[PDB]
């Protein structure tokens, strides 16, 4: 909600292609395989 | 350089085939991950 009026320092644009069912696997607590080898996602992932 | 016991093919392929269902379609993803260091990004509104 506050994205429209919030200040950000710098961005990293990271682009890739995954499977359709792997999109819902991107969630804190959900299981998956991307988080370890293709893209590192911390549980405090500051991004969108 | 040979296949067999304890020696498998190093690479695996994503299962994208025509018979795949709706949930197995390729989704392209772009992620803007924000880091702090010089803050040239603000909000339009």
């Amino acid at each position, epitope marked *: 909600t506050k994205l429209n009026d919030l200040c950000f320092t710098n961005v990293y644009a990271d682009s890739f292609v995954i499977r359709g069912d792997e999109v819902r696997q991107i969630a804190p607590g959900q299981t998956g395989k991307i988080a370890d080898y293709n893209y590192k996602l911390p549980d405090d992932f500051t991004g969108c | 350089g040979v296949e*067999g016991f*304890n020696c498998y093919f190093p690479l695996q392929s994503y*299962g994208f085939q025509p*018979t*795949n269902g709706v949930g197995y379609q390729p989704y392209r993803v772009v992620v803007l991950s924000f880091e702090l260091l010089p803050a040239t990004v603000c909000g339009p509104k």
Partner: antibody
Amino acid sequence: EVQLLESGGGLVQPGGSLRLSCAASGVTVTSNYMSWVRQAPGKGLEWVSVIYSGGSTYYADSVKGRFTISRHNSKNTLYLQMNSLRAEDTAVYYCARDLREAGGMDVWGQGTTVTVSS
Amino acid sequence: DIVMTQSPSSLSASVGDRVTITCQASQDINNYLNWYQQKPGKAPKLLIYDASNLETGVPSRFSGSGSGTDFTFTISSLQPEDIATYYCQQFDNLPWTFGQGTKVEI
């Protein structure tokens, strides 16, 4: 050279602590996939837990908080201490060197059963 | 989640009859189903992986096929060694739940 031997198992009571362990040689548990799996009597196989490369722990639904996993490269061993057990847990357990998706559980050992009878 | 509702669980036939195993899945499995030979009381032994390739050691009397919803396992030459429980497993959608398997006994 390479070998995955099993240790532990018995007749622990429900809610009673026990220690299952898989000792590996020829691989590295910390930086490679390895897994533990159960097989219930009269039922098919059931996935339990995995250890990945990079300090990422993933468990099944029923063993999310009941098992405790810890790995060591000194002897290439994986330990799971199980406390607060349930009676249904009686089943034959295996430690496996799962290698992603190229045919699941291609290599088998012996496997040890755990009876949680009173 | 992908769950398979395999109708047959324990079928009995005479010696020499064909063995046809069909394993239906809720969602589409993309060339990613396995067929094992587990034997009475013994540990499962994997025969067919990735739904199309044969492993060195598997007898020629076993065949597996399928790419999608439908998956088939065929045994033409019935033997007493084939009295076992054949399982269908989907290593496709996390979590990778195992199958129940149909038990053939002659």
